[PDB]
Symmetry: D2
Subunit: 333 residues, 4 copies
């Protein structure tokens, strides 16, 4: 099992750490957060308002964060080039702070001793991957890669199935997204994105998302054929993608249900899900799928113009894919 | 000023009454609700969690509901044919209970003495109207009409402008809607629509809506060219329409903005609004427009496939249109 | 052997009692009656839960029965409780969860169908009330119709018992900051009897009257007339908190209050009364089966005789598990 | 003769004090200092408000100034308060609303720029604290730096004053069910000092410590050491409620408590202390400029000496209007 280091014990960093222990696919050996001390890290990992108390043991012992008897080395560095990743035995580093997404900034970890870096966010220049869509294009020469956004990971598996079977001429997407840590409880300041500063509890907030554009950077045939926007709404977790698209070949709705059902049962098992149940957002809380096609929620205007709905736990689905990507990277070593 | 009777003092009935006094276009002279007594009606009209305390005076006096010194006759009938609408001087009756939407059911009010009935909801058989779109097709022979739904009243004015200028080849709509009185606080029973029974506070609930299909009945050229679905989200009021459509003529996004701005300043003034501000849902609370085009929120894939965003106060916007429709009917009398 | 139980009403309490029965395995649900929810809808409502998640097990409709974990349950669709053939389905006890038959005369209708005992999963004006860990030992086989009090009394009474037994409660006033309930409205709607309860649940803090503190007196007779309170309904889907401000007879340092509560949670009230010193919030008690959990860090003392004691409760799980525990206790006395 | 005021910080308090100044017209805002919010963003933040709606007038950027209702306001972008040219803009008083300069030494920096008096819109460790209607008459012209206490202190103190003056408060314990604040997090985030305050604001009832009941003893010296309490943050955007459980020296029937509160709201505490017998909920006090409104129907008495008194407050508009009223009072004493 590959030994992993996690930079940042924020919402992504903690959920990637929890996915690592829950799945057991990788071994967390080090965590770096210059602001959260060891005692606070135990509290933040143990208790979760959204996903509940950690099913396992969490304790501070000899200056280390012990999760299920596994001692994890804690670092408090502000500069990523100063983290002694190699000393703690961290082969891979999950860059989850969101402030080092370019290969230049993400490359500071390689100076500490890390061999590979996985950016748990979209990157402007690093190669992007989505498990089940283009992870086979990963090779050992790639020292710094990105796992795209949770929305890019929800849309791309559905886009792959729909394009492979009927061909997406063009598509426009909307994601009705749950509130995130970047939003404000009451009307506050967000100098760059004014709407994002408005009260998260009281508002439907339109937001810009490069996730539908990013899908074309992972399914190169769809490059320039997809774009979209988001609406942040007052729910703590679980989001939904709404893809309105035009198809090349005609597609009856029940043929597109059969097509997604096959992919969910075969190659995209655990990545792409399929349901015909009368589901609502809370039904996908702690669901580890990247995306789950909602058959009953979608609607077709004609054989070439459809609206396809797909749910995703923006927190769990994505953190599990970061772990799956590293497990795949380790197998190619 | 025409004298109006309101059947049902529910959320629509109270807000239509409020719009009548706020705008002064109509005179409410009678209200019928077999369940809410006069004292409770004073409380429900005066205090509103969403729109605040009524700006004016409300009292119970001599068995009459007195709003701004205007005495309103109160009836407690379960059978709509037994309401003495004519005795109270009610020329038009707003049928807001939602349980008498067919012309046969809504026609019962004419037995009590009413001359015309306006169903404040979609009807299976009554002629439908949307102010600013097809209200000129109303004529004095029509004794029972429908004002369509609040979502139709938001989509149809935008669809009218977009189709008149560029031609809508086909369109698919999503409405991210605020919670309604038909939803449940916690997981409860809704035998017909299972998803609508699930906890309103905790969930994004997909729902079916014939509002996009209904635009084809007020704009006969778009018949069969539009359909959609809804997502109910945890906000008390203000909803948004997201129209993804293909245009016949090419349309740069600034040309779409230009023609919408012109319609909002000219013929659809007060019905269709236009904004370039960094708005969120709460900015449209108590906004009486039927729909307000959000220029900054929309996105174009090319010059033939666009996503157009438009806000609507699902409560005040529609209620004011019920009053405007009656103010129109009176002018044709 | 395990008591066979019938559940009247498949509403929020009825489903969670049925859930607690299978999760704990203390009793066997053999029949359910709801005249409005059909068998197919019952499968959906039991399987999926927004608050507590999908049911850990299997649930399916098969041959007109609701099979949960391979156990077939007989479904009835009766509006009149006297017309339910409880005895035919083998139901020895009936949980009256509809909330509309809380008097002994109304709840007694279930005995006409063949039931032997009726447990009202709500407060009753006349039936004997019980709170597990406080006065369940006063239950005897002569009692054919009993009440399990409310969720709020089942939270307050175990804390009141410990505090009164050790220091004596001279007088107390409590406030419960409660989660939204099925009786509330999504937007400003009509609630003819309780006008405030009709106002939008999402937008408001709604003051409400509750006889739960008064009901503690009917379970700890020494505190009769010594306790009263009110509630504030707030916009959270589940988990509530009790705030008891009281005057004590004997002096009590806050660490002595903590010490005696910790002892009771580890000994006789294990699983009923909990104790924590952690930096907890409401979501930390979601699906917690305790009747009440004393929050040591949240409470505050003015002086040795005047304190504010905070205690959390999953108003949904804590209570339904106590309905199951009460019937398991009744079965042991048979 | 409107006193010309400067506002340091265009955060929620700063904007709401500016809004109260124009809505009430009691003082003239002439300058605003915020080193992070530029003029164009200030127009947006003042014009649109999720809680209180769009401003009742006009807001625009013109010639590098913020013009509200035709009144041009000078904008400063200084990080050091001592470097703000308050005197050049004509600002006689400065409202210190950033929350980071609450000591008299820190708040005194504004006097170096040319200000004559500084009003801290928050509690201060050392500055004299005032609550309008309870101790504002103790303000005198020697006081160049004062504090307006907190929003909860301004709610509790006027009710405590009436109750103590008529019946005498032997001892009291207060709980405030408070709306969410800017210091909370949307989802589980870090708050190193107060761990519970970092947990998701939308999902939780969060117990919190508050020195607001203790602080009432400063403005009402007769209640020093006689009051303490805690808070519960709940998922509502605005409007909070105080719950005072207290023991009275003199017996008081609940109708006598109502009678004396109604008299104070109609007489000396008109506009500060309100009184209602209506079936009110929190949203009914949104944009209500009262410091506290006694809810007659929500409170409950156990006996003539032990009561729970409920009082609502718009934690935003109540307090902001008191900052403006306090400065209008200071100007009258000049």
């Amino acid at each position: 099992k590959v030994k992993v280091g996690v930079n940042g014990f924020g919402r992504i960093g903690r959920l990637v750490t929890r996915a690592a222990f829950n799945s057991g696919k990788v071994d967390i050996v080090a965590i770096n957060d210059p602001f959260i001390d060891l005692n606070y890290m135990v509290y933040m990992f143990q208790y979760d308002s959204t996903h509940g108390k950690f099913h396992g043991t969490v304790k501070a012992e000899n200056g280390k964060l012990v999760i299920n008897g596994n001692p994890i080395t804690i670092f408090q560095e502000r500069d990523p080039s100063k983290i002694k990743w190699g000393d703690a035995g961290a082969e891979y580093v999950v860059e989850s702070t969101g402030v080092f997404t370019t290969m230049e900034k993400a490359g500071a970890h390689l100076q500490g001793g890390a061999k590979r870096v996985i950016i748990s966010a979209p990157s402007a220049d690093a190669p992007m991957f989505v498990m089940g869509v283009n992870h086979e294009k990963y090779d050992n020469s790639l020292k710094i890669i990105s796992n795209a956004s949770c929305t890019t990971n929800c849309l791309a598996p559905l886009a792959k199935v729909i394009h492979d079977n009927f061909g997406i001429v063009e598509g426009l997407m909307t994601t009705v997204h749950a509130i995130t840590a970047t939003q404000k409880t009451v009307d506050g300041p967000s100098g760059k994105l004014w709407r994002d500063g408005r009260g998260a509890l009281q508002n439907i907030i339109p937001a810009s998302t490069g996730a539908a554009k990013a899908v074309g950077k992972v399914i190169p045939e769809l490059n320039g054929k997809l774009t979209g926007m988001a609406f942040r709404v007052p729910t703590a977790n679980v989001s939904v993608v709404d893809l309105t698209c035009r198809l090349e070949k005609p597609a009856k709705y029940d043929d597109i249900k059969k097509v997604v059902k096959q992919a969910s049962e075969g190659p995209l098992k655990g990545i792409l899900g399929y349901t015909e149940h009368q589901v609502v957002s809370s039904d996908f809380n702690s669901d580890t799928h990247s995306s789950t096609f909602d058959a009953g929620a979608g609607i077709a205007l004609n054989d070439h113009f459809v609206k396809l709905i797909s749910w995703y736990d923006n927190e769990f689905g994505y953190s599990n894919r970061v772990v799956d990507l590293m497990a795949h990277m380790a197998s190619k070593e």
